[PDB]
Structure 1
Amino acid sequence: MYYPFVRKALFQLDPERAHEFTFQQLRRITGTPFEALVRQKVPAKPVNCMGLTFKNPLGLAAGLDKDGECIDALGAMGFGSIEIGTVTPRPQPGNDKPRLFRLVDAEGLINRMGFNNLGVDNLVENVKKAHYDGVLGINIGKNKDTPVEQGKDDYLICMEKIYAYAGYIAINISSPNTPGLRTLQYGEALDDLLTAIKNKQNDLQAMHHKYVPIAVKIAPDLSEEELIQVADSLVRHNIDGVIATNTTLDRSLVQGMKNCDQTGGLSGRPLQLKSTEIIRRLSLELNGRLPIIGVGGIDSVIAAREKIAAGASLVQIYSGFIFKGPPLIKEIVTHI
């Protein structure tokens, strides 16, 4: 049916209850013939990035399908790639509810989920049963109780288990909803993490006889100097790619709006400009040494093209998918 009516109905429910209802129906049809109800034709626009071939530049950002339960249904919708997760070594409930809020007038969202997921072992089993033909990205992170200074082991543990089933691996060290998680992107802490990750990738390549690229997901709340250091570190350690950007703690564009003071990360339209400008500065520093996957407030063909012009090789969407639904996918892929 007409998505606006779909949205109209969904927006009457609590934000998370709306997501749970939606995924309840998707899981109900994913991998079955019902899948035709959400499927849509999309032209192919192949892009080579990180040694991989993406059928099209548009991907589903991480956070929607955290446990990889609806890979096939979502894929049928047209996405060139799908990023599942964030997943942690052990299952965890996440923060207390409510943890998700809508800013309808700003076409944005604020969340403090806290990595609510069923664990990496469960996710691996879901992936084994999926038939998706696009690129599958697996996004991983640290369990809440794991001391952030020993967080590196949680990443390595997940890497060992998903290596054989991932198109690329996404390292999440930018979530604002896990205490201390963002500290991992600064100084020696970042260098030590990247050193371990690249070494683990090296061992896994010898074990599985194949190279699985790794991309690091950074926050949008980094200063010019910090952004330069991160970019340089990524280059020195030969990281395969960088995903910019995650949600922001900034609230300067949503003052005076309902839920504007809720704690958490802000996404959607209010993140669009900040995100694009970070991509541009990032791209300037990287100087083509490694690709950028741009994400943040993309809600139209032009917004996507702006990210590409700023320097991104690929783009992902989340919030915009919730406000504009399936039609957005078709629009971007068709005209990007």
Structure 2
Amino acid sequence: DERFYAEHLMPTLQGLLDPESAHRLAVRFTSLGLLPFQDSDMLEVRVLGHKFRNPVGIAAGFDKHGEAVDGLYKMGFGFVEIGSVTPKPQEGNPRPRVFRLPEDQAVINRYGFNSHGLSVVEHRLRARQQKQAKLTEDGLPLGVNLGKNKTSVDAAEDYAEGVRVLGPLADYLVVNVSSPNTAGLRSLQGKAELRRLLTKVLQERDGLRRVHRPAVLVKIAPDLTSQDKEDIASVVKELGIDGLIVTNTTVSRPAGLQGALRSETGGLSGKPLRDLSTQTIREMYALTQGRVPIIGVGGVSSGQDALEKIRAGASLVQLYTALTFWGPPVVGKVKRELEALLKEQGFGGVTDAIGADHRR
């Protein structure tokens, strides 16, 4: 129940544990299915070669190693993304590396891709691969988000290894070139780098057998220049990339942040990123002429937040940070409010609202 979690459970949990410990305990509880809304057809969306029974997903970073997929579907998410996963295991940055900004409903993290590695996650997904095939057919798809190791010398070979190893187990894969916490990674977003990296990714993906061939998406940052966005849009059309994830966390620090920890290094998420993300979705949708599916992510904690990103051009949305403040009831809250607003605004379902701001 919303108020109980919002007002009692979550604050108490937050007073008791540092945020990294709270996150680990939350993954454990979720993966055991220790948690307590029926989805309307208005919320169903068809995109990326799949049906999604509702358009609200959990963003990458919550379940980094694939341990809690089924408990996430049970929380009400229409789709789950895990990762980012790197080819070899690696520890990530020294602690502390995650900071709560409760007066801003924000988080700053600099995990640095702590990952159990491809092999461990491959085994975990294979142990439930046929159960995921049926979830997917029932409208509950799985994405896998790929990163690169810290000491790797050849970024494109790290991503290609992830497509070869986890591509056969995913409905879509994400080439995450926008973490702000791995040195040099964001420079993969530049025109020449990106084109060469994505050509190699797509060749690897196309060499998979047909029933194991995922869609491929690129996840980008909220901090790009106008020139960067134009170059991304052009590469994405030139290569037939299947969609974009918009956006990762920001390295900016918007005026007015009150949290005592606002000057920690790392990516900032939650409310202060919300409109910078929505504006990036609006611009990428226009530059791609509405023809490249976008998954909208950054500061979503309500139905109105989801629908804004929807009308700016997103076909699906994701959240993470709002879960850390509101807990599990936020998921049904976002869905029930989104459905009430679609009705109030005269849309037949999510699908008719996608990109609607661009048609006024």
CA distance in 2, matches of 1:300, 1:172: 26
| Residue 92 (structure 2) pairs with residue 94 (structure 1) | yes
The one of 105, 114, 117 aligned to 2:115 = 117
What pairs up with 1:12-161 in 2 under 5 angstroms? Answer: 12=15, 13-27=17-31, 29=32, 35=33, 37-39=34-36, 41-43=38-40, 45-130=43-128, 131-132=131-132, 133=135, 134-147=140-153, 150-161=154-165
Residue 88 of structure 2: SS of its match in structure 1?
Answer: coil
Asked if structure 2 preserves the Cα contact closer than 8 Å seen for 1:86 and 1:141, the reply is yes
Q: With the length of structure 1 as denominator, give the TM-score of the two structures.
A: 0.93
1:138 maps to amino acid: V
Residue 105 of structure 1: SS of its match in structure 2?
Answer: helix
What pairs up with 1:254-269 in 2 under 5 angstroms? Answer: 254-269=256-271
Higher mean Cα deviation, 97-106 or 229-238?
Answer: 229-238
Residue 83 of structure 2: SS of its match in structure 1?
Answer: strand
What pairs up with 1:229-248 in 2 under 5 angstroms? Answer: 229-248=231-250
- Other-structure match for 2:10: 7
C-alpha spacing 1:223/1:115, structure 2 compared with 1 (3 Å): same
The one of 166, 173, 181 aligned to 2:170 = 166
- Other-structure match for 2:344: none
Q: Which runs of 5+ in 2 are unaligned?
A: 339-360
Q: Which runs of 5+ in 1 are unaligned?
A: 30-34
> 1:248 offset after TM fit, Å?
0.2
What pairs up with 1:304-323 in 2 under 5 angstroms? Answer: 304-323=306-325
Asked if structure 1 preserves the Cα contact closer than 8 Å seen for 2:104 and 2:257, the reply is no
> 1:208 offset after TM fit, Å?
4.8
- Other-structure match for 1:179: 183
- Other-structure match for 2:357: none
How many aligned positions are there?
325
C-alpha spacing 1:22/1:210, structure 2 compared with 1 (3 Å): closer
2:330 maps to amino acid: L
C-alpha spacing 1:40/1:14, structure 2 compared with 1 (3 Å): farther
- Other-structure match for 2:284: 282
> 1:276 offset after TM fit, Å?
0.5
2:149 maps to amino acid: N
Asked if structure 2 preserves the Cα contact closer than 8 Å seen for 1:241 and 1:291, the reply is yes
2:245 maps to amino acid: I
CA distance in 2, matches of 1:285, 1:331: 32
> 1:129 offset after TM fit, Å?
2.8
2:14 maps to amino acid: F
- Other-structure match for 1:303: 305
The one of 195, 199, 202 aligned to 1:191 = 195
- Other-structure match for 2:353: none
> 1:54 offset after TM fit, Å?
1.1
Higher mean Cα deviation, 278-287 or 129-138?
Answer: 129-138
> 1:253 offset after TM fit, Å?
3.2
Percentage of matched positions with identical amino acids: 41
Higher mean Cα deviation, 282-291 or 96-105?
Answer: 282-291
Asked if structure 2 preserves the Cα contact closer than 8 Å seen for 1:39 and 1:73, the reply is no
CA distance in 2, matches of 1:161, 1:208: 15
- Other-structure match for 1:251: 253
